[PDB]
């Protein structure tokens, strides 16, 4: 009839299983998103920071010519700036979750600097707006409007 009783976490902690799957328990929403950001940084930090760097429109600046085409594509389409707008346009509750997520990523890098590839260290710290920028790039400028279809 009714679902099984939900679990009420009394402390913030990540319980990792044998396959590297994080079970993030938070006393509130922000805490959970923070733990999620920490977990993702742990498991995929290098590529996430790199992607966030590109979404800022700083791929060419941070890594050179190999990232210049995407920089031109994202800047021309005003993605980094629109991300700042979308971030400000978030509801207070959800913006706090995005901030917590970004904070989780920064905290992991802070406590585990050896796990962060030298080339992407210049990306830190990340912000809630960076999280919005990547998602905006992925949805609208990778899935919906790809550079390939516009440029040919």
């Amino acid at each position: 009839q009714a679902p099984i009783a939900a679990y009420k976490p009394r402390s913030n902690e990540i319980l990792w299983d044998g396959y590297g799957v994080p079970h993030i328990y938070g006393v509130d929403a922000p805490s959970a998103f923070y733990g999620y950001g920490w977990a993702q940084a742990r498991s995929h930090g290098d590529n996430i920071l790199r992607l966030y760097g590109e979404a800022r429109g700083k791929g060419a600046e941070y890594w050179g010519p190999d990232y210049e085409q995407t920089t031109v594509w994202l800047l021309t389409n005003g993605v980094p700036e629109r991300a700042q707008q979308w971030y400000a346009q978030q509801s207070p509750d959800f913006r706090a979750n995005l901030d917590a997520f970004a904070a989780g990523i920064n905290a992991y890098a802070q406590q585990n600097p050896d796990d962060i590839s030298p080339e992407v260290r210049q990306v830190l710290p990340v912000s809630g707006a960076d999280v919005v920028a990547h998602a905006h790039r992925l949805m609208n400028f990778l899935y919906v409007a790809s550079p390939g279809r516009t440029l040919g």
Partner: protein, 520 residues
């Protein structure tokens, strides 16, 4: 990607079933999926999402679950501009461009940066780009004013009822994707989601090409509400599905047809053999159990073979070349399934690359064309067996050149290799009919090939109380240098030995290998 949602009545225990089965590159960084479980006093979510995303796109919990597949919603328009006198011709008059002078830094080989100028020009349509051929194109993207993509997904997956779920989806903040839903209450739903521009003319093909950028006639400004898009809830057939095929056979029997929606929403092209298998596997089975449901997901039928070998074999057997004859007999004795031990599979693929093109989507070679009236049994037959046999002749050479023989075991050439794990592959190309997908790369010098795209996150969930779910992630849950969680799941994938997904605290505590306390 594949997606299945089964209604209670079509199951043995009376609980809905859900399949999350997205197909994406195994290497593209932004397409990498990550498995996680979040729990707070107010919500719980389990599932996979693309790295960097703060919300879980492929999620489920004790109450509900959803999955996504690409539908290619045409949310953008590329316009061909007619340049004239420094501007562009629009409605009979030369319009000036909006111009902004920007700049960005370019890192140099010595670590320094060079300031590089970047002029951003825009027409009334949107930002303007110049192609290599010199064509001036303006790209107009819809939904640039929808900042709530992430929050909508969050509210969708934490929804307490289907009604709340639909209300969230109705915000129209998610610009694309087919979304399938199922819950413990027994409701299943398929939604052709996305932000689609309202247009008064032109079919999808027209809007996917370079639209005339010299007239306000083609300048759209509004988008369709959720009620205007193809959707299905609790259909008579007891299930919904989508394997990237147009939304015209989301269930069986159908609940709507192409004529019920504007022709620019989705193509009306032939459904792939994989999509036809999807419909068959669900509609043909009843009294489903979670176990049977999973077994069905493992399907790897060479459907293309069923549609062509009956006509191809006899034609090939009468060819004077004894090698062609031997090839015909090899193909004839094949059970038409992409198993590791199959000695005919590689050869069949090589033939199909010619018969149906490199992507196996070609339709010109079949005798009977695809028909929405026979959506899972067409196209069929070989139009020109003579030419088809010549194609087999060439395929025989290609197979030997690539693999060293015309009868090399499928799984001997097809391998799944991650770090030091090297296991035999099975299943294959979706357009050849394989439901479970592994898009094998071209072989290396020794005929060895590996997946370049295909199965990634795979999970099957039964919404019983408590829920029961199983899953696997092809390339592990981490890609950080030195991690032990990159290649630790591929061996199980090679045997379809799925992990039980743990949502209950007691299960998690019994499986915990590392505890990370934290404070925010």
């Amino acid at each position: 990607s594949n997606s299945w949602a089964v209604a209670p009545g079509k199951t043995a225990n009376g609980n809905a079933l859900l399949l999350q089965n997205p197909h994406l590159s195994w290497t593209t960084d932004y397409f990498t999926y990550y498995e996680a479980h979040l729990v707070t006093p107010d919500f719980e979510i389990y599932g996979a999402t693309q790295i960097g995303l703060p919300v879980i796109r492929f999620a489920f919990n004790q109450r509900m679950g959803i999955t996504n597949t690409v539908n290619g919603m045409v949310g953008a328009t590329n316009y061909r501009l007619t340049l004239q006198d420094g501007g562009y011709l629009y409605d009979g008059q030369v319009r000036p461009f909006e111009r902004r002078q920007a700049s960005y830094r370019l890192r140099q080989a010595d670590g320094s940066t060079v300031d590089k100028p970047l002029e951003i020009r825009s027409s009334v349509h949107g930002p303007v780009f110049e192609r290599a051929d010199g064509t001036a194109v303006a790209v107009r993207v819809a939904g640039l004013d929808r900042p709530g993509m992430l929050e909508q997904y969050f509210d969708m997956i934490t929804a307490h009822s289907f009604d709340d779920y639909e209300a969230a989806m109705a915000r129209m903040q998610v610009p694309t994707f087919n979304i399938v839903y199922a819950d413990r209450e027994g409701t299943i739903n398929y939604s052709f989601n996305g932000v689609a521009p309202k247009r008064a003319e032109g079919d999808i093909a027209f809007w996917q090409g370079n639209v005339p950028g010299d007239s306000s006639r083609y300048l759209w400004t509004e988008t369709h509400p959720l009620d205007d898009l193809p959707r299905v809830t609790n259909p008579p057939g007891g299930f919904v599905q989508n394997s990237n095929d147009p939304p015209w056979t989301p269930t069986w029997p159908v609940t709507y047809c192409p004529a019920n929606h504007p022709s620019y929403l989705a193509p009306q092209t032939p459904h792939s053999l994989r999509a036809q298998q999807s419909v068959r596997l669900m509609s043909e089975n009843d009294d489903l159990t979670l176990e049977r449901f999973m077994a069905l997901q493992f399907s790897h039928r060479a459907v293309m073979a069923d549609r062509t070998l009956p006509d191809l074999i006899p034609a090939a057997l009468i060819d004077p070349d004894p090698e062609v004859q031997a090839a015909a007999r090899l193909l004839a004795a094949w059970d038409r399934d992409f198993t590791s031990d199959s000695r005919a599979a590689l050869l069949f693929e090589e033939w199909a690359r010619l018969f149906a093109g490199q992507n196996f989507a070609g339709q010109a070679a079949f005798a009977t064309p695809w028909s929405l009236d026979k959506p899972v049994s067409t196209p069929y037959g070989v139009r020109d067996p003579k030419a088809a046999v010549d194609q087999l002749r060439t395929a025989i050479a290609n197979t030997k050149r690539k693999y060293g023989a015309i009868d090399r075991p499928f799984g001997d050439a097809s391998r799944m290799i991650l770090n030091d794990v090297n296991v035999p592959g099975a299943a294959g190309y979706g357009n050849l009919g394989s439901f479970r997908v592994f898009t094998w790369s071209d072989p290396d010098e020794n005929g060895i090939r590996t997946p370049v795209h295909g199965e990634t996150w795979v999970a099957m969930i039964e919404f019983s109380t408590p829920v029961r779910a199983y899953g696997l992630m092809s390339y592990g849950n981490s890609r950080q240098p030195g991690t032990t969680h990159y290649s630790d799941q591929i061996e199980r994938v090679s045997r379809a030995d799925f992990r039980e997904l743990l949502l209950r605290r007691e299960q998690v505590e019994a499986a915990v290998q590392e505890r990370t306390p934290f404070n925010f």
